[PDB]
Enzyme design. Structure first.
Site: not given
Ligand SMILES: [Cl-]
Ligand SMILES: [K+]
Ligand SMILES: [K+]
Ligand SMILES: *SCC1=C(CS*)C(C)(C)N(O)C1(C)C
Ligand SMILES: [Cl-]
Ligand SMILES: [Cl-]
Ligand SMILES: [Cl-]
Length: 164
Positions: A11, A20, A32, A104, A117, A132
């Site tokens: 980040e 962002d 955010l 996050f 997934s 995936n």
């Molecule tokens: Cl897959």
């Molecule tokens: K960032």
């Molecule tokens: K965030």
């Protein structure tokens, strides 16, 4: 390495309001502020978050305070989420950090959109899960970050965050 260090890498740290990767006003370590295109709306959210009139600038200590709150809330949210909690609880601590990282970045609802997934992760089919996970908008829009997170899920190691 741990989730704080990992997210700090992914980040960054900025003490003034910035946009962002999606164009949204943010500050600190990926905090955010708002999806509104209004900078004044973002400044208002910032002042509310910090408890003073900041005019868009905060200190490192203040950025780290918001970060700690945001990490805590992400984890607590996973545990309250009937889709994400079973997968989280099935994982080792390194892979848990990869899941927190995704939440996050994209939120609980977004990560719940990865059910295909998530199932593979819960079944510990690590290479299949990694394949995936990459079939996603997430991977296409933030490929370098996604590749780090995916490597963490594939290997259960911190290798992707070692040179960093
Ligand atoms: Cl897959
Ligand atoms: K960032
Ligand atoms: K965030
Ligand atoms: S995200 C889809 C779901 C999984 C992974 S296969 C499971 C934890 C079993 N959960 O109950 C679902 C249906 C939400
Ligand atoms: Cl907040
Ligand atoms: Cl500052
Ligand atoms: Cl990226």
């Amino acid at each position: 390495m741990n989730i704080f260090e990992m997210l700090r890498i992914d980040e960054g740290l900025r003490l003034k309001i910035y946009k962002d990767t999606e164009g949204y006003y943010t500050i600190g370590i990926g905090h955010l502020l708002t999806k509104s295109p209004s900078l004044n709306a973002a400044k208002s959210e910032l002042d509310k978050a910090i408890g003073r009139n900041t005019n868009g600038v905060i200190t490192k200590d203040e950025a780290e305070k918001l970060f700690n709150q945001d990490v805590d809330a992400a984890v607590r949210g996973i545990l309250r989420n009937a889709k994400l909690k079973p997968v989280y609880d099935s994982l080792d601590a390194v892979r848990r950090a990869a899941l927190i990282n995704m939440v996050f970045q994209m939120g609980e609802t977004g990560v719940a959109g990865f059910c295909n997934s998530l199932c593979m992760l819960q079944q510990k089919r690590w290479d299949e899960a990694a394949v995936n996970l990459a079939k996603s908008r997430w991977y296409n829009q933030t490929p370098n970050r996604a590749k780090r997170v995916i490597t963490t899920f594939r290997t259960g190691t911190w290798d992707a965050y070692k040179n960093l």
